[PDB]
Amino acid sequence: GLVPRGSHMSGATEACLPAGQRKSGMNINFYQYSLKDSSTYSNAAYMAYGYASKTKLGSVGGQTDISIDYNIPCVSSSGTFPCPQEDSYGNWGCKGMGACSNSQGIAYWSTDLFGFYTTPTNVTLEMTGYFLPPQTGSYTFSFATVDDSAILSVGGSIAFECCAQEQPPITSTNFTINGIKPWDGSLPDNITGTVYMYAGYYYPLKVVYSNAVSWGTLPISVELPDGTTVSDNFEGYVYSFDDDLSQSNCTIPDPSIH
Ligand SMILES: [Cl-]
Ligand SMILES: [Cl-]
Ligand SMILES: [Gd]
Ligand SMILES: [Gd]
Ligand SMILES: [Gd]
Ligand SMILES: [Gd]
Ligand SMILES: [Gd]
Ligand SMILES: [Gd]
Ligand SMILES: [Gd]
Ligand SMILES: [Gd]
Ligand SMILES: [Gd]
Ligand SMILES: [Gd]
Ligand SMILES: [Gd]
């Protein structure tokens, strides 16, 4: 065969070749989410697009460092310091700080999430951008843990539409990683999803993340085809492009034959 046959029954993930000015990093949009609401974020429709029906709080662009690790304050005898969740104890104190005088169950304001001043105790955020694979092959994305609820989607018409990064969210619930908080209360660590990607094509990437109370955590990694792992800092891998809905050739439905 002069040419490759193509992935079977058009199984290839859709990718993009945006012709505009590339910008390092992902865009982060922040949306309202109610303190102690442990039900809203348990719905697939909400995590895919419904989040954007709530008040938009703000945004920051150009973010390459994308893992979430938010610790609430312990108001202690020696001042106010963030408590690592594993160091919290009793009712309650923080190891090396003694007893904390403040409630675990109120809203707290902080710039910890990408420098945006908001309430990381209770918020939903949407990260959008394009993932640029340097190598052709299988990529395994993972969340080490999820506190409270999250999804990761990769691909044109799954994350968002090519050359349309800034548009309202699409409705696809075909998540690459489903880390939605179960109604039943369950859910395990190191949750994963794999995508076969072709080098030099730009793959739409969406992460939606929500927290209702206190600590928030979402450590994001990808394992490359060469078996190495990139964690937290995706510099060199993730990019944004301004919308160009007029770029006719932007969508590549099958990179395996393009
Ligand atoms: Cl603090
Ligand atoms: Cl202590
Ligand atoms: Gd980080
Ligand atoms: Gd950092
Ligand atoms: Gd942090
Ligand atoms: Gd931070
Ligand atoms: Gd920090
Ligand atoms: Gd940080
Ligand atoms: Gd589409
Ligand atoms: Gd939480
Ligand atoms: Gd491996
Ligand atoms: Gd860090
Ligand atoms: Gd724009």
State the distance from the centre of ligand 10 to the C-alpha of 213, rounded, in angstroms: 4
The answer to whether domain 1-70+105-258 and domain 71-104 are alike in fold is no
Residue type, 174: N
Residue type, 19: A
State the distance from the centre of ligand 13 to the C-alpha of 137, rounded, in angstroms: 31
Residue 190 phi, psi dihedral angles, 5° rounding: 45, 60
The answer to whether the CB of 187 falls within 8 A of the CB of 195 is no
In whole angstroms, give the CA distance from residue 51 to residue 29: 10
**Nearest 5 degrees, angle CA 98-CA 99-CA 101?**
140
State the distance from the centre of ligand 10 to the C-alpha of 76, rounded, in angstroms: 21
State the distance from the centre of ligand 11 to the C-alpha of 50, rounded, in angstroms: 35
State the distance from the centre of ligand 12 to the C-alpha of 73, rounded, in angstroms: 17
State the distance from the centre of ligand 6 to the C-alpha of 215, rounded, in angstroms: 13
Omega cis (within 30) before 92: yes
State the distance from the centre of ligand 3 to the C-alpha of 187, rounded, in angstroms: 24
The answer to whether the CB of 205 falls within 8 A of the CB of 159 is yes
Task: Report the candidate in 157, 163, 130, 159 with the shortest Cα–Cα distance to residue 244.
Answer: 163
The answer to whether the CB of 93 falls within 8 A of the CB of 5 is no
What are the residue ranges of helices labelled H in the chain? 44-48
170 alpha carbon, closest ligand: 9
Beta bridge pairs of residue 142: 192, 221
Sign of CA dihedral 103, 105, 106, 108: positive
Q: What is the CA radius of gyration of the chain?
A: 19
The answer to whether the CB of 70 falls within 8 A of the CB of 215 is yes
State the distance from the centre of ligand 5 to the C-alpha of 132, rounded, in angstroms: 25
In whole angstroms, give the CA distance from residue 165 to residue 30: 15
The answer to whether the CB of 28 falls within 8 A of the CB of 216 is no
HSE at residue 31, side-chain half, CA atoms within 13 A, is 20
What are the tokens at 146? Answer: 């999820």
Strands 123-131 and 26-32: antiparallel
State the distance from the centre of ligand 6 to the C-alpha of 233, rounded, in angstroms: 12
**Nearest 5 degrees, angle CA 81-CA 85-CA 90?**
90
Q: Is 71 helix (H, G, I), strand (E, B) or coil?
A: coil
**Nearest 5 degrees, angle CA 45-CA 233-CA 133?**
75
State the distance from the centre of ligand 8 to the C-alpha of 112, rounded, in angstroms: 7
Q: How far is CA 27 from CA 36, 99, 248, in A?
A: 26, 38, 23
CATH hierarchy code of domain 1-70+105-258: 2.60.120.1560
What are the tokens at 228? Answer: 């190495």
The answer to whether the CB of 237 falls within 8 A of the CB of 19 is no
State the distance from the centre of ligand 3 to the C-alpha of 232, rounded, in angstroms: 5
Q: Give me the residue spans of the domains in the chain.
A: 1-70+105-258, 71-104
Architecture of the structural domain at 71-104? Other non-globular (6.20)
Q: How far is CA 110 from CA 94, 201, 221, 224, in A?
A: 19, 36, 24, 33
State the distance from the centre of ligand 1 to the C-alpha of 13, rounded, in angstroms: 42
State the distance from the centre of ligand 11 to the C-alpha of 195, rounded, in angstroms: 14
Q: Is 6 helix (H, G, I), strand (E, B) or coil?
A: coil
Residue 52 phi, psi dihedral angles, 5° rounding: -80, 0
- Residues comprising the chain, all counted: 258
State the distance from the centre of ligand 2 to the C-alpha of 92, rounded, in angstroms: 10
Q: Is 8 helix (H, G, I), strand (E, B) or coil?
A: helix
Task: Write down the experimental method used for this entry.
Answer: X-ray
